[PDB]
């Protein structure tokens, strides 16, 4: 992901 982008981001977690």
């Given at each position: 992901?982008?981001l977690?």
């Open positions: 992901p982008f977690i």
